[PDB]
Symmetry: C3
Subunit: 227 residues, 3 copies
Amino acid sequence: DWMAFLIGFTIMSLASLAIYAKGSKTSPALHHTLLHAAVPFIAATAYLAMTFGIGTLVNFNGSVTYLARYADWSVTTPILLASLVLLAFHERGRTGEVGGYLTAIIVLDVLMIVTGLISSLAVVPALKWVWYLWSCAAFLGVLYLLWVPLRAMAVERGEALGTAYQKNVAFLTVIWFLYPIVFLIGPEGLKIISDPTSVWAILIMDVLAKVVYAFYAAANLETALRH
Amino acid sequence: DWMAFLIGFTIMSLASLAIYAKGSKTSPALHHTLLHAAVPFIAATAYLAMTFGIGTLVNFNGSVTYLARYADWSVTTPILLASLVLLAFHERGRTGEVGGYLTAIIVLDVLMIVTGLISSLAVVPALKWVWYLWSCAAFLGVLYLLWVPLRAMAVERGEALGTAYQKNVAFLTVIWFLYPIVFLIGPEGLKIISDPTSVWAILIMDVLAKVVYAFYAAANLETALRHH
Amino acid sequence: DWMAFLIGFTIMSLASLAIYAKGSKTSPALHHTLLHAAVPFIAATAYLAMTFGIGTLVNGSVTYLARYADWSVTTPILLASLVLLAFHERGRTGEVGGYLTAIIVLDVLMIVTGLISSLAVVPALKWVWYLWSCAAFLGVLYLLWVPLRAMAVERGEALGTAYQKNVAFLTVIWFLYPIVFLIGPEGLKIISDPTSVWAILIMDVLAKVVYAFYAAANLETALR
Ligand SMILES: CCCCCCCCCCCCCCCCCCCC
């Protein structure tokens, strides 16, 4: 409940501070540290909002949808994707090159979030699942870019940075896949799991995706940079 | 009306897939392919929303406003403008150079859309037209950047890429000008033409602007690259 | 109140036109001119909205959504210009982007959190959010004053002098906003809505119009 949101805020607020301090401030690593440190600060703001039910909509039938949660995802996810794109290019790209991939992957990712929110708010089952599927299509669009063309470039340019990108993407894919799963089985979908259970699961997921991943990604870059 | 939206979605969904696959994946062409392929995918999501009247607000005495339509325009138009800016610079610029023109042209363009939405929703005629005009001012702001300074740079840097930009801009101008015309004539404005007729017209316009233009722009760039 | 908004629109509309015309269209200066000219045009659109009470919420306490909408876009653009100055108009792939994203995220959050504080009808919540917004502002100020300023000075004296001058001016003016909020009807309600509105207009002109011309002069000094 409130306790989960307050735990989320505290973890995310501290983590953001920790990620920046601990993170490298040198050359290419710096801009990765800045991006990774920002995500939790957004998540923190979101979680603080959710504790006081700011942005949280209560349907006539007492059903709750957290706008703040989706608002977080709409900004954070793209920032995490942006960091990955830069890794793939090995921190060098000509005018418009990285920008094109960024725009492509952000558009898909943000749409994935927006469509997911439309699905959540949909009170008609048929519509709810049509939109969920479209969201999933967007997610596959994101995953395709990451796993095929971007990963292709990631490996082509060198083993060290290619190894770092592949490690980061793998971790990202598994964690990111939990969100659509939780949605499906959660109160926004099949309603197999309780609101509180889904919220508690998301907190654990959010910490892995934003905090653990950040420290993991830093180690993979630091290991790769050493070579 | 819903049939038009479903037709729009299907055309835009397929087109997006087609544009990416057909588009070149090499050097400067690649980043143009990625940007051009994204637009229809947004438009598609928008059109799907509109079929189920998701963003659609209904006001008495025949006033409908499709929020999803404007949401599409607020993202797509800038992406199309972004692609043009990159063309003008001949796919090379110093730090912040392209960014300055992007921010400038996006701010004007997005404002043009936002102001247009305010105009559509405005219940006082005087306000509705004040905002329409302000939107038009923004559009002129966009057109100025495209046609004067950006076109100047486009031609100065080389004939091949300059020819491609000029062709793309010309096509852009004519199509983009239809939107303010339809708005004026449409239920959002003078209510001279029916909601359904205006919606069907916009679908035709949207296909030209996002799908036909994409293939046209691609050909003009590939023509310029081969000639060079 | 409406007269202030109409005055704001007219000042901001003309200023934006003036800033572009007067601004240099060459090399690094150009992209600074384009960014600086756009800000007032946003502010203008905002002020026009506010005169006709578009985005203005009646709920007893009144909060101008158009005002915050303006701030959420303009402030980042002004911060973006400063970041570019610090790098001396040269940075490797992703370098400037990382600092931009960092400083924009903090800045935009600062605005949105401030809006949450304004809309909050419960005092305790209103001040929790105000403080969080302030934390974000300090986050912005830190980046500007420490790491970005460090790079600004390290790269050369001329551009380092220009950045330091611009930042100083920015900090002082930008600090008025949280002060006005605190003592204004969105906070302690020590000063009237009209007084706060008229004060913000004066502040907004300094921050977007005067600062633009000041920043332009400082860059032309640095280029010479
Ligand atoms: C460094 C330059 C990269 C900047 C990234 C640009 C990303 C643009 C953001 C796109 C957002 C699209 C999501 C909006 C969907 C709205 C569609 C309406 C459906 C109801």
